[PDB]
Amino acid sequence: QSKAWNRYRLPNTLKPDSYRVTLRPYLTPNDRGLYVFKGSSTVRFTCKEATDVIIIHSKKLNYTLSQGHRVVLRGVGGSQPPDIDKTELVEPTEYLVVHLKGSLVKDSQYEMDSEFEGELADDLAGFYRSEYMEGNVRKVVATTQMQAADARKSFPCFDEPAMKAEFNITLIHPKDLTALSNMLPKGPSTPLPEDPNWNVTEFHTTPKMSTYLLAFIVSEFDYVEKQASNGVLIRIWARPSAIAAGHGDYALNVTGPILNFFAGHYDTPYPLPKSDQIGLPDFNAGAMENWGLVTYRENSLLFDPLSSSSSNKERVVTVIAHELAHQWFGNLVTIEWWNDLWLNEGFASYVEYLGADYAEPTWNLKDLMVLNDVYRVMAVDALASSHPLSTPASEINTPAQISELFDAISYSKGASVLRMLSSFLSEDVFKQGLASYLHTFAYQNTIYLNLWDHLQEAVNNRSIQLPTTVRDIMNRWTLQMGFPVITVDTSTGTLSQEHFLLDPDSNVTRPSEFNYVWIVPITSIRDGRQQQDYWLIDVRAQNDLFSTSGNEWVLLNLNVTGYYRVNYDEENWRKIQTQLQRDHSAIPVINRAQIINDAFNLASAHKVPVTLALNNTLFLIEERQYMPWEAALSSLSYFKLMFDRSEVYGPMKNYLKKQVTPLFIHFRNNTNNWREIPENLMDQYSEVNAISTACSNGVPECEEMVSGLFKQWMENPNNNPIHPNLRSTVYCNAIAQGGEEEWDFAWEQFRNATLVNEADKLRAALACSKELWILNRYLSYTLNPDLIRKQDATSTIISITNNVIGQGLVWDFVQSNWKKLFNDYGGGSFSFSNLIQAVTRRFSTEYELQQLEQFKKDNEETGFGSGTRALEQALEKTKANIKWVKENKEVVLQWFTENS
Amino acid sequence: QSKAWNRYRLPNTLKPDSYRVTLRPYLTPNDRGLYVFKGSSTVRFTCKEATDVIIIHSKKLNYTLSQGHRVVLRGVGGSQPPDIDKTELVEPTEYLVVHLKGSLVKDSQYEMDSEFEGELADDLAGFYRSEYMEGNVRKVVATTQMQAADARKSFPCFDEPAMKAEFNITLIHPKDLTALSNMLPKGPSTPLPEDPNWNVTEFHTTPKMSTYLLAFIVSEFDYVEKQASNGVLIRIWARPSAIAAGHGDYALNVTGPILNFFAGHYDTPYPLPKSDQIGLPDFNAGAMENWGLVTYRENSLLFDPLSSSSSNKERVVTVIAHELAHQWFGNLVTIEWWNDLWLNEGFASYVEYLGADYAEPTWNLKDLMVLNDVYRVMAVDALASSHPLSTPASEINTPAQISELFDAISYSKGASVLRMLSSFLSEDVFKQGLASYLHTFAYQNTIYLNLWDHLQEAVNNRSIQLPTTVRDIMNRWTLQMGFPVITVDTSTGTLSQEHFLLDPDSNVTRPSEFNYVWIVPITSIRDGRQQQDYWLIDVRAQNDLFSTSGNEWVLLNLNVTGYYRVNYDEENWRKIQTQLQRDHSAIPVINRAQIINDAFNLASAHKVPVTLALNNTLFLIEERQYMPWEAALSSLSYFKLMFDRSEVYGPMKNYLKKQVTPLFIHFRNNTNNWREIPENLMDQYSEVNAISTACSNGVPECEEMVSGLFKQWMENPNNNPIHPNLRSTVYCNAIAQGGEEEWDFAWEQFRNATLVNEADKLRAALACSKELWILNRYLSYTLNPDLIRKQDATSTIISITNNVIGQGLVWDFVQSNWKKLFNDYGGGSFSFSNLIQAVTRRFSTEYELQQLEQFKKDNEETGFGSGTRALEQALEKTKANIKWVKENKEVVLQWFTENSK
Ligand SMILES: *[C@@H]1O[C@H](CO)[C@@H](O[C@@H]2O[C@H](CO)[C@@H](O[C@@H]3O[C@H](CO)[C@@H](O)[C@H](O)[C@@H]3O)[C@H](O)[C@H]2NC(C)=O)[C@H](O)[C@H]1NC(C)=O
Ligand SMILES: *[C@@H]1O[C@H](CO)[C@@H](O[C@@H]2O[C@H](CO)[C@@H](O[C@@H]3O[C@H](CO)[C@@H](O)[C@H](O)[C@@H]3O)[C@H](O)[C@H]2NC(C)=O)[C@H](O)[C@H]1NC(C)=O
Ligand SMILES: *[C@@H]1O[C@H](CO)[C@@H](O[C@@H]2O[C@H](CO)[C@@H](O)[C@H](O)[C@H]2NC(C)=O)[C@H](O)[C@H]1NC(C)=O
Ligand SMILES: *[C@@H]1O[C@H](CO)[C@@H](O[C@@H]2O[C@H](CO)[C@@H](O)[C@H](O)[C@H]2NC(C)=O)[C@H](O)[C@H]1NC(C)=O
Ligand SMILES: *[C@@H]1O[C@H](CO)[C@@H](O[C@@H]2O[C@H](CO)[C@@H](O)[C@H](O)[C@H]2NC(C)=O)[C@H](O)[C@H]1NC(C)=O
Ligand SMILES: *[C@@H]1O[C@H](CO)[C@@H](O[C@@H]2O[C@H](CO)[C@@H](O)[C@H](O)[C@H]2NC(C)=O)[C@H](O)[C@H]1NC(C)=O
Ligand SMILES: *[C@@H]1O[C@H](CO)[C@@H](O[C@@H]2O[C@H](CO)[C@@H](O)[C@H](O)[C@H]2NC(C)=O)[C@H](O)[C@H]1NC(C)=O
Ligand SMILES: *[C@@H]1O[C@H](CO)[C@@H](O)[C@H](O)[C@H]1NC(C)=O
Ligand SMILES: *[C@@H]1O[C@H](CO)[C@@H](O)[C@H](O)[C@H]1NC(C)=O
Ligand SMILES: [Zn+2]
């Protein structure tokens, strides 16, 4: 608006060099019960272009006028300090405009001192407080989450990733509590000269960081430390009680290997002197890559071996790797602007599994990436509402736009694209370019093009053959949204590409350059033996590689490395099916899951018949791996949700029971009569799946075993015999196969629950009851805050909705008590979006659509709030559901009956 | 409108004298694939008042134009027939108005020849069709059902009960099949001149009768015959296989004696040479009393001693008695209008027990009547939405209202009134008066006043002492709806009477000439010793007969003879509970059941504490008789319907489980490990009650036994180990405690079932499944006429709505397919009301009432027809339920919890 303070982007008039921030957090409420902190900061900025105004980001800061102005300007090195005209604080653009009576000459450093007072509120932003209940005592900790902005809230600073500067952090903390920051403590905490109750801790100057990664936490958390033989001191800080137990031991045992792996992959030594990972009890954000002081949710860093499932073990190892990867890529080489967030977060997501694999080589974690990210993001990208990975930097300005960029696409899509990048570049050449990128751009900001250039330079040195320059071959997958579905005409060995859209009748309004065409790297296998390689340059191309003979099957996207679905002629599909039946080993496990997942998704776009998809699920009877089974069960979930209350459910269960029985018996023998869990994490997951589906479909042995296990627990409570991994499954099936007695025992345990994980497991299991009265009684308990915590109420109601009988109960509940639910819980505590999505997920009939539409008009006056933008979405999904059921019910029903 | 055709009442200007109907039923689909019957008819009518328009009933009949008109007017006796102006067909009133260019000469007989064609569909109305399967060949049987406004569908006629006439019936039927009509065939079947393959059979002229008593059935059914002592030839006609298997043996064993008994009791001879009882595969009503050709559902007539249960045996004898009773009260003497429908249904329902008791003297079915009718109607009669036994004629005009009157009030309330009337007038005096009524108005239509006059004659003849005239005393029980509740102050022995209302806040909009007061006849017993009787003529009275001293307890309405509820003070109730726990035998078995039923209903009306009624159910643990247990289970059903989907259900089940366990074991030992059955009929019913109640509540052995028995039947499909009487409960409980396999086995057996009784049991049991998907599939099956016969469609839906899981499914189904159910399915008006009551018997929340009100607002255009009153009553009950549950949920839960332990 012709005024720099009106503009959302900092003027490039001055750039910071060094910072000195001394903040004293008062973790005790003052007058009006306000937790406030007092801070003093100074910035030695350098005048890049002669100007008359200084603009510094500042949010929720009272400031103190040391002289006639809130700030004091002093020129350094004999620099003349221009007199300050006036001080103004702009809110729309968190800016501290300090108009000066004169112009600051260029090539001269000026320091601006600033004493300020802020509120240590529980906003989970900037400098915030977190109160946890240690025993029966409230304990408050002062932590920091300066993602995107928020850094301004803590102290006056150039809050932009481009503005890199050294930061000297000093914390005045109570003598009892300990203070932590990005760097090591410069000196041991000394009693503050005044009020000896408080100590003063100074930390060594931080390597030129870009803000947003600064962190200063003062608390009483204890810690387990280990000096790695590479020079980095690994310290895992957490609640003293948990550190006293072995909860934090696993993280310390896994951090060292992960750091070493990344050091090699990044070909760079750990930039900071030490690595502290702290487990905050709350911390709604999953994790933060604060340089040196990584903050994690207590549940994602601590692993109790007696009450955490192997799934939690995967969670901690993987999340640790993601943030530890950020320490090299994203902290040493930060993005110039938030528009390139996809490159930073995406790379971290991709190399996350790479690191975890080094730590646990017997888990094959890298394989899970596809099901966890590639297929997850593929579903969203296959909509006409998708956005291109790259966005014009000018477009992103407001803080809200920055937060918007943090989409699942930015993470998974980026990781998938970068995985394809590494595959067609050969990990070795990719790593070479990455190493050069980091070294050449160490301690400075960059654009995604810089990485493309270094990769191309490595391409030339290694002389790898790429159809076009890395930039062009990557622009196709970064400047336009969506992914190509490659159809293979084996008869004439022809290859074709198209923008895959799950809804066939979708108007792709977004005008994408390259007219939605992609340079797809194609890797193929023939009769098991991998062929050479091919790059689809145009929409349609012919190559003998894809040509097949009388009994020849070709399968593209080996290990689904490339972000593209594949469609084949019906003949090739049948050849693949015959191979899967005689020996599934020929097809790599990853591609077996690909076959099932792609078939179902292609059937949704009406590119292949639904029967073909179910045909690709027939070989599961012999499959003993996890990925293939998981893919099929995930896809068949929609079928169950649509036919759970219909006749089709009968034949469907019979078919699934026939397929699961062998897998269940296999595990029963392997686990020695359900006594010893399998070793490989993948096998552990499949064992849980086997029992769950076997009992759900009605395998007799499964229900007998789960019932017996729960009964053994009922006989001897306090010593649960069910192993943590199999607890949720046994609990739900046992309660379902049992009556009021079992539910009563479970309810008692839930009320006496001591660990949140166990409590939530019991809560969901209690909703597995098959008695209408018990479910209604549970619904009444859900609303009561005393019985069910309001934070957990929405999830409990959703869990009852999942019960086939519960669907009707919850639907009447939401339709009749929307007013109460919305009015009493208008706050974010109740996610109405998730609630309405869950209650309307099975809607597949015109009657149900009429009810939902009536609900919309009936409660129109009381805005659905978070529900809005999801209720209209549910209406659209309901309409699509009606069409799908009326177009596939007969075919699906016949298939199950004849194939069961 | 003023237009006579627009009016729903036939003009009195024309009176029918005699008719000649010649229906020809085509038992093969036409080019349009629709079975169609073609017939011609001529009505001889005397012109009571000169008229220029002739109005007759015509329904779904395409009349062939003759002489440029649908009808042809011919002069009888030389009278001139005025020229026909025009013939319009008014559909709303089903009136074929034959406008004339002149006024019919007054007091002149005329004849109207009319040819017509109609659809022989499966609507179970007029001339419909019944398709049964023999071997692998479909067999079609054309039968007639004209209970109300359906004779018009078969032929143009004055379809009103008052318009009696003699009907000459000629049936052109295939030479192979046999034509059955009200009277005997007049001579041998003669070959149709056009086609020898068809036969022309005319029957003897029928005596003066109403159009709704006609029956024309052509069938290949065989029959078993046996002349009765009165000489009337009793023949049981049914499917060839059924008669060959001796399913009709029991029917022939009871029909003859029962018919003679009725004739001897009222000294009135049956005026027809034969009385054929025929069982039709497809029939809506349980049975129709068509004079000479009484029609019955196969379930109500066929009886296989090796597969039918003791209850089935009672059903057959009772139904046959009810229909034979009608042959006197309904056919020989008919009602003037449907307003006094009770005069026929009520008497036939009450005297049915007398006939059954005669045929089966070791059953004591008259004891059951107390719970079968008196208490059954008291529930609906209590609602402020009931109707006086003799509703003003003006209210009942449209055919929908006519069919609506066929409810508990016309049947049970009438029978209960007759029970009380006979009790205070003595059987001898009562039957003497009835004989005069029958002989005086034979072949004539009568009203309630006519009955009172003949009864008064017997009263004076036998010098019976009454407070006032029979008319005044019984007008209180017939001209005002509802029944009185007597408050007994044992402290001072004072009595009072007031209209019993389930909702104390319910607004009665129906005015009463007697201002809701009754000359209640009262009979009281003291410590089991009967005392002198008293008549509560005034609203309030006092007597020492009711005043108690020390620990003396007084029970009014000994053997629930009177039609009223007894409300004792807390003192008497305490003494009664003391007696029940000390020696329940002291209190009459019937009165023990009376105590449980009265206590609960009084509590539901917010007149006594709910705890009091529940307390009265603590003697059940030691009770071994059937009647007490029966009333308790029936009364606690309301609690279940109101708390089955609530937290109270758990404690309630535990309590009942505790009470039934002893009875269950007792019967186990008595039945020798469930191998034998009790000898006494009542004991057999209680044994089945024990097993069903135990399995439903959760007694472990019960669930194990029923499952094992069904498993053994699955092993040997042909040999069913379960004893016929125990099949009902075992089948249901097994299917419920079983899964898809059990449901599949039952479905296959149901489709392959032979005896209707067994098929009915399996059909109802299939609804006991606890799988939502199975119940949804079952509901779709109900609509399919091929899988479930249209006659049993609503019954199956009601069974599904009975299942707790099915309640929601059916409610949404009813809301979604009201238009289809109301239109495609006629339901014969006997249903719909039942379906509405069944789907709305669990409503206890404002949201549920809102849904019901929305249903009415969204389906007012579609119409509720017969269900109109039922839907309106539902609204009243739902509102009362909302208040009752809110005021009693906690106390009911606490009581069960404390007693369950
Ligand atoms: C944050 O801490 C760093 C040190 O870790 C501070 O940088 C230091 O700045 C002072 C001037 O303020 C430098 O002193 C100068 O030393 C040179 C000789 O090296 C001398 O010729 C000059 O006359 C002057 O005394 C000091 O060297 C420098 N230290 C380093 C290692 O660069 C920084 O100023 C602190 N932050 C802020 C905002 O003050
Ligand atoms: C906050 O500052 C206080 C004061 O410095 C710390 O308390 C401890 O103070 C004593 C000196 O008064 C020191 O430790 C003590 O010294 C003896 C030897 O004389 C030694 O055996 C013990 O360590 C003893 O406690 C030390 O300065 C200081 N800290 C320690 C390690 O004891 C207090 O610990 C400070 N709090 C934090 C969290 O840094
Ligand atoms: C900084 O100044 C703001 C604006 O004056 C203060 O905000 C006020 O304080 C109350 C709470 O005590 C807030 O609810 C209102 O937004 C403001 N009201 C008033 C009366 O001014 C803010 O409190 C100050 N900072 C701190 C840490 O206290
Ligand atoms: C974490 O490391 C500790 C050792 O610091 C483990 O304790 C033992 O050490 C070995 C090697 O790590 C483990 O394999 C053994 O299971 C432990 N005991 C023995 C006798 O060697 C500890 O198990 C590791 N994991 C956790 C979760 O604490
Ligand atoms: C029905 O049958 C009767 C008897 O055959 C037909 O004859 C009339 O009815 C009386 C009955 O006793 C006969 O005696 C008379 O000869 C007839 N009466 C008149 C007034 O004609 C009778 O016509 C037939 N019904 C019809 C056509 O109305
Ligand atoms: C109907 O009557 C028949 C014939 O009386 C009954 O069959 C039995 O016939 C044998 C013939 O020797 C007699 O010894 C029995 O006394 C008859 N039993 C009875 C109960 O009468 C038949 O049981 C009767 N009832 C049924 C159900 O058909
Ligand atoms: C119903 O419950 C009992 C009979 O089962 C009646 O008597 C009570 O019994 C309890 C338990 O022994 C005592 O604690 C109470 O004091 C008794 N009642 C009184 C009023 O003393 C009870 O009165 C009945 N409740 C009714 C009829 O409402
Ligand atoms: C709660 O659990 C603890 C630990 O198993 C047990 O000692 C205690 O008795 C339980 N309390 C109740 C009330 O069940
Ligand atoms: C049909 O008529 C013939 C005489 O033509 C007769 O023998 C036969 O029994 C009749 N059939 C029936 C069942 O009416
Ligand atoms: Zn991250």
Short mmCIF file of N, CA and C in Angstrom, two decimals, chain A residues 643-651 653-654 740 770-774 776-777 780-781 804-805 811-813 815-816 847 851 858, chain B residues 643-651 653-654 740 770-774 776-777 780-781 804-805 811-813 815-816 847 850-851:
data_model
loop_
_atom_site.label_atom_id
_atom_site.label_comp_id
_atom_site.label_asym_id
_atom_site.label_seq_id
_atom_site.Cartn_x
_atom_site.Cartn_y
_atom_site.Cartn_z
N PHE A 643 -21.23 -51.77 2.10
CA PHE A 643 -22.11 -52.96 2.12
C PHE A 643 -22.25 -53.56 3.52
N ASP A 644 -21.72 -52.89 4.55
CA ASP A 644 -21.75 -53.46 5.93
C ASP A 644 -23.19 -53.75 6.36
N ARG A 645 -24.13 -52.88 5.98
CA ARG A 645 -25.54 -53.03 6.42
C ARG A 645 -26.37 -53.61 5.28
N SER A 646 -25.73 -54.34 4.35
CA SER A 646 -26.45 -54.87 3.17
C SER A 646 -26.23 -56.38 3.04
N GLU A 647 -26.97 -57.03 2.15
CA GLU A 647 -26.84 -58.49 1.94
C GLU A 647 -25.42 -58.82 1.45
N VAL A 648 -24.79 -57.90 0.71
CA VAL A 648 -23.44 -58.17 0.13
C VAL A 648 -22.45 -58.48 1.25
N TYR A 649 -22.71 -57.97 2.46
CA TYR A 649 -21.76 -58.18 3.59
C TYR A 649 -21.63 -59.68 3.87
N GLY A 650 -22.73 -60.42 3.72
CA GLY A 650 -22.70 -61.87 4.01
C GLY A 650 -21.67 -62.60 3.17
N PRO A 651 -21.80 -62.64 1.83
CA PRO A 651 -20.79 -63.27 0.98
C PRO A 651 -19.40 -62.65 1.18
N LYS A 653 -17.93 -61.39 3.85
CA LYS A 653 -17.25 -61.94 5.06
C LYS A 653 -16.79 -63.37 4.76
N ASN A 654 -17.64 -64.17 4.13
CA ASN A 654 -17.29 -65.58 3.83
C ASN A 654 -16.00 -65.61 3.02
N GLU A 740 -22.24 -58.22 28.90
CA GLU A 740 -22.10 -57.08 29.85
C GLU A 740 -20.92 -57.33 30.79
N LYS A 770 -21.78 -55.53 21.08
CA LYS A 770 -22.82 -55.88 20.08
C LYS A 770 -24.21 -55.70 20.71
N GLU A 771 -24.27 -55.08 21.89
CA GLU A 771 -25.57 -54.90 22.59
C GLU A 771 -26.04 -53.45 22.40
N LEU A 772 -27.26 -53.27 21.89
CA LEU A 772 -27.77 -51.90 21.63
C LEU A 772 -27.80 -51.12 22.95
N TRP A 773 -28.25 -51.75 24.03
CA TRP A 773 -28.38 -51.03 25.32
C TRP A 773 -27.00 -50.57 25.80
N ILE A 774 -25.98 -51.43 25.70
CA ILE A 774 -24.62 -51.08 26.18
C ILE A 774 -24.12 -49.87 25.37
N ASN A 776 -25.87 -47.53 23.77
CA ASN A 776 -26.62 -46.32 24.19
C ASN A 776 -26.07 -45.84 25.53
N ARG A 777 -25.84 -46.77 26.46
CA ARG A 777 -25.28 -46.40 27.79
C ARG A 777 -23.92 -45.73 27.58
N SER A 780 -24.30 -42.12 26.38
CA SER A 780 -24.64 -41.23 27.51
C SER A 780 -23.37 -40.89 28.29
N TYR A 781 -22.50 -41.88 28.51
CA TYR A 781 -21.23 -41.65 29.24
C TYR A 781 -20.35 -40.68 28.46
N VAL A 804 -21.39 -51.23 13.59
CA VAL A 804 -22.51 -51.26 12.60
C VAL A 804 -23.80 -50.84 13.30
N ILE A 805 -24.06 -51.38 14.49
CA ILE A 805 -25.29 -51.02 15.27
C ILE A 805 -25.18 -49.56 15.69
N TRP A 811 -26.19 -41.48 14.54
CA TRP A 811 -26.86 -40.62 13.52
C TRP A 811 -28.05 -39.90 14.17
N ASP A 812 -28.87 -40.63 14.93
CA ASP A 812 -29.99 -39.98 15.65
C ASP A 812 -29.41 -39.02 16.68
N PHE A 813 -28.35 -39.43 17.37
CA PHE A 813 -27.71 -38.57 18.40
C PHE A 813 -27.30 -37.24 17.77
N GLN A 815 -28.20 -35.86 14.92
CA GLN A 815 -29.35 -35.14 14.33
C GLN A 815 -30.16 -34.46 15.44
N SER A 816 -30.29 -35.10 16.60
CA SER A 816 -31.15 -34.55 17.68
C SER A 816 -30.36 -33.62 18.61
N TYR A 847 -32.49 -42.02 0.78
CA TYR A 847 -33.12 -41.71 2.08
C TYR A 847 -32.08 -41.05 2.99
N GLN A 851 -32.07 -37.32 4.67
CA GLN A 851 -31.87 -37.06 6.12
C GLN A 851 -30.75 -36.04 6.30
N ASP A 858 -32.22 -28.02 8.93
CA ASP A 858 -32.77 -27.94 10.31
C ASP A 858 -31.80 -27.17 11.21
N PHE B 643 -37.46 -49.59 28.05
CA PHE B 643 -36.09 -49.56 28.63
C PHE B 643 -35.14 -50.54 27.92
N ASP B 644 -35.61 -51.20 26.86
CA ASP B 644 -34.77 -52.22 26.17
C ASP B 644 -33.52 -51.55 25.59
N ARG B 645 -33.65 -50.31 25.10
CA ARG B 645 -32.51 -49.61 24.47
C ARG B 645 -31.87 -48.66 25.49
N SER B 646 -32.16 -48.85 26.78
CA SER B 646 -31.60 -47.96 27.83
C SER B 646 -30.72 -48.77 28.79
N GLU B 647 -30.13 -48.10 29.78
CA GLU B 647 -29.25 -48.78 30.76
C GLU B 647 -30.07 -49.69 31.67
N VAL B 648 -31.36 -49.39 31.86
CA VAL B 648 -32.21 -50.17 32.81
C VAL B 648 -32.34 -51.61 32.31
N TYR B 649 -32.21 -51.84 31.01
CA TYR B 649 -32.43 -53.20 30.45
C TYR B 649 -31.54 -54.22 31.17
N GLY B 650 -30.27 -53.88 31.39
CA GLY B 650 -29.34 -54.82 32.03
C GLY B 650 -29.85 -55.29 33.38
N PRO B 651 -30.03 -54.39 34.38
CA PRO B 651 -30.60 -54.79 35.67
C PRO B 651 -31.93 -55.53 35.51
N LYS B 653 -33.09 -57.39 33.05
CA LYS B 653 -32.84 -58.78 32.59
C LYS B 653 -32.35 -59.60 33.79
N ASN B 654 -31.41 -59.06 34.56
CA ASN B 654 -30.85 -59.81 35.71
C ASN B 654 -31.98 -60.19 36.67
N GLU B 740 -25.34 -66.82 10.55
CA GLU B 740 -25.89 -66.91 9.17
C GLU B 740 -26.29 -68.36 8.89
N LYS B 770 -29.61 -61.42 15.27
CA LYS B 770 -29.02 -60.22 15.91
C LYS B 770 -28.02 -59.57 14.95
N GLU B 771 -28.10 -59.91 13.66
CA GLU B 771 -27.18 -59.32 12.65
C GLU B 771 -27.94 -58.29 11.82
N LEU B 772 -27.49 -57.03 11.83
CA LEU B 772 -28.22 -55.95 11.12
C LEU B 772 -28.36 -56.32 9.64
N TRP B 773 -27.29 -56.83 9.02
CA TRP B 773 -27.34 -57.12 7.56
C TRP B 773 -28.39 -58.20 7.27
N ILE B 774 -28.45 -59.24 8.10
CA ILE B 774 -29.45 -60.32 7.90
C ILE B 774 -30.86 -59.71 7.99
N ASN B 776 -31.81 -56.63 7.47
CA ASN B 776 -32.04 -55.79 6.27
C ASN B 776 -32.43 -56.69 5.10
N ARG B 777 -31.68 -57.77 4.89
CA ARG B 777 -31.99 -58.72 3.79
C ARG B 777 -33.40 -59.27 4.01
N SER B 780 -36.18 -56.85 2.93
CA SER B 780 -36.35 -56.84 1.46
C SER B 780 -37.15 -58.08 1.04
N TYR B 781 -36.87 -59.23 1.66
CA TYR B 781 -37.59 -60.49 1.34
C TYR B 781 -39.09 -60.31 1.62
N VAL B 804 -34.87 -55.69 18.81
CA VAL B 804 -34.35 -54.35 19.21
C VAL B 804 -33.54 -53.76 18.05
N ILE B 805 -32.68 -54.56 17.43
CA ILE B 805 -31.83 -54.08 16.30
C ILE B 805 -32.75 -53.68 15.14
N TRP B 811 -38.31 -48.71 11.21
CA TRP B 811 -38.83 -47.32 11.32
C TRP B 811 -38.42 -46.54 10.07
N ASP B 812 -37.15 -46.63 9.68
CA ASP B 812 -36.67 -45.93 8.46
C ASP B 812 -37.37 -46.52 7.24
N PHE B 813 -37.51 -47.85 7.19
CA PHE B 813 -38.20 -48.51 6.06
C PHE B 813 -39.63 -47.98 5.95
N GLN B 815 -40.88 -45.18 7.06
CA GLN B 815 -40.82 -43.76 6.64
C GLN B 815 -40.49 -43.69 5.15
N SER B 816 -39.55 -44.51 4.68
CA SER B 816 -39.10 -44.44 3.27
C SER B 816 -40.16 -45.01 2.31
N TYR B 847 -37.54 -36.50 20.39
CA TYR B 847 -37.04 -36.64 19.00
C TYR B 847 -37.88 -37.70 18.27
N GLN B 850 -41.11 -36.21 17.49
CA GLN B 850 -40.89 -35.26 16.37
C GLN B 850 -40.88 -36.05 15.06
N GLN B 851 -40.14 -37.16 15.01
CA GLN B 851 -40.06 -37.99 13.78
C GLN B 851 -41.47 -38.46 13.41
#
